[PDB]
Design a binder for this molecule. Sequence first.
Ligand code: CN9
Lengths: 103, 100, 90, 89
Amino acid sequence: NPYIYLGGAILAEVIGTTLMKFSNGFTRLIPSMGTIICYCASFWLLAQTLAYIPTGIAYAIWSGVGIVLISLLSWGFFGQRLDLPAIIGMMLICAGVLIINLL
Amino acid sequence: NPYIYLGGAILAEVIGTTLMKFSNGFTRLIPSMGTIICYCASFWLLAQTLAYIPTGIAYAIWSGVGIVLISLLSWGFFGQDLPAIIGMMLICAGVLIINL
Amino acid sequence: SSVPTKLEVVAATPTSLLISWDAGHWWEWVTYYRITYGETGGNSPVQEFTVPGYSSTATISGLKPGVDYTITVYAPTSDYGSPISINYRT
Amino acid sequence: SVPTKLEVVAATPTSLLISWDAGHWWEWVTYYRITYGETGGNSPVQEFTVPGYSSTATISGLKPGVDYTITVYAPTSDYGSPISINYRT
Ligand SMILES: Cc1nccc2c1[nH]c1ccccc12
């Protein structure tokens, strides 16, 4: 049950981040209000995980599934804007994040 | 150009969360008004740096540089499981090969 | 296919004007409209004030009776469309 | 700790201007709440709030001659007990 509040906390920020791509610099009403609602709900559900589960575990799970979801919700909604050297660079950034939190 | 205000927004978020720890439940006025400003600026700096950098690309760089700057500021002048700075340099390595 | 649209003067008064518009649907709906009103002759600057983007009406007060004014309603950016400007004599 | 030193500056039969030492530069709270009511207890009390930067507050609409009990509460009680005083218009 508490290992699910994080799954709702990541996804809520996932939606709020991709809706921010639609907010048009927070100048468009409905996408501007959407990111605020989703970020507020993710905070409140994360505020329920910071009791049972610790910090790095609940955060590395976020950063892992988040980077794997908001990046997949980047081609399905427009495709591509720009690409540069390696996607493996993202893989080793995550590997770099994982060896200071867990380790 | 997408990196200056991406890193500048990472500083704003880091200062925002570290200052949230200083103030209580948004009760201490001067630090609470500060936290409000930097997360408002971060929301406006991340939204403006997202139209250029792909969504998933700016995700890792922020999370990496953030905890890089968080752990750097932690040992900086506050307190001090540290395997080594090998993890900081590993974040640095990947941020480089996605950079320009 | 631009916004806003249909700028009309609802209520009138020697010292105030009540205007409105039919902006558009939800996919357009912006966060703030800025509205400018001034004299038609053009011997002065132009007054300006903003209003949230969920309201389609605006009340203007402090006008002089008998003078013809020009009222214009803008958008946050020029991407939504060319602004609409009208005239009215109090 | 905060608030501290609650006293009445000006006094009119139907009003009381109170003040306090909120604190020092950075230890300001966001708001204080003020409770003024009859010193007896035949009816409930009246209450209002004041922003944290302000160090004064006026209390209007009082009856002449009656003794009142004025209490100022911090946002919480984790930084000191609320200071309460008495005054007779
Ligand atoms: C840009 C970015 N990357 C990773 C995590 C976050 C983020 N912005 C946030 C705002 C509130 C809570 C978490 C994040």
